[PDB]
């Protein structure tokens, strides 16, 4: 069981573990696209908000592979047209930089990024 986030990293993982939970990403609404667009949106406040002005940090690096990289990769469907806009992957790049801005800066990223085509 939890609580309420109190911490600026309970809200953190609250909102990447919220992410995760989306069962099928992209979606046009194929569904669903316009809810997941908004997490990444509240995703990216929060990572700005997290400037552990007095709140935490740990879950940037597990953001990295299971968002970030993750959505570059399908991003690339021209396909039929998923739904899926230009400003879908400048949302992603922004988030990257969100990740980046935060203490942070290694050969983890090197590592996790590699792995995906990127």
């Given at each position: 069981s939890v609580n309420c986030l109190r911490l600026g990293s309970m809200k953190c993982t609250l909102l990447l573990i919220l992410l995760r939970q989306w069962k099928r990403e992209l979606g046009s609404?194929?569904?669903?696209?316009e809810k997941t667009k908004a997490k990444v949106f509240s995703a990216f406040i929060t990572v700005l908000q997290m400037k552990e002005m007095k709140v935490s940090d740990i879950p940037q690096y597990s953001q990295?592979?299971?968002?970030?990289?993750e959505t570059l990769q399908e991003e690339v469907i021209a396909l039929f047209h998923r739904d899926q806009r230009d400003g879908v992957?400048?949302?992603?790049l922004h988030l990257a930089k969100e990740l980046c801005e935060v203490d942070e800066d290694g050969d983890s990223w090197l590592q996790v990024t590699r792995r995906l085509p990127i």
């Amino acid at each position: 069981s939890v609580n309420c986030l109190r911490l600026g990293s309970m809200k953190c993982t609250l909102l990447l573990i919220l992410l995760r939970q989306w069962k099928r990403e992209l979606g046009s609404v194929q569904q669903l696209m316009e809810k997941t667009k908004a997490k990444v949106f509240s995703a990216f406040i929060t990572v700005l908000q997290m400037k552990e002005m007095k709140v935490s940090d740990i879950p940037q690096y597990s953001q990295l592979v299971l968002n970030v990289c993750e959505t570059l990769q399908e991003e690339v469907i021209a396909l039929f047209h998923r739904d899926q806009r230009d400003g879908v992957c400048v949302l992603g790049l922004h988030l990257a930089k969100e990740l980046c801005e935060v203490d942070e800066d290694g050969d983890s990223w090197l590592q996790v990024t590699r792995r995906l085509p990127i």
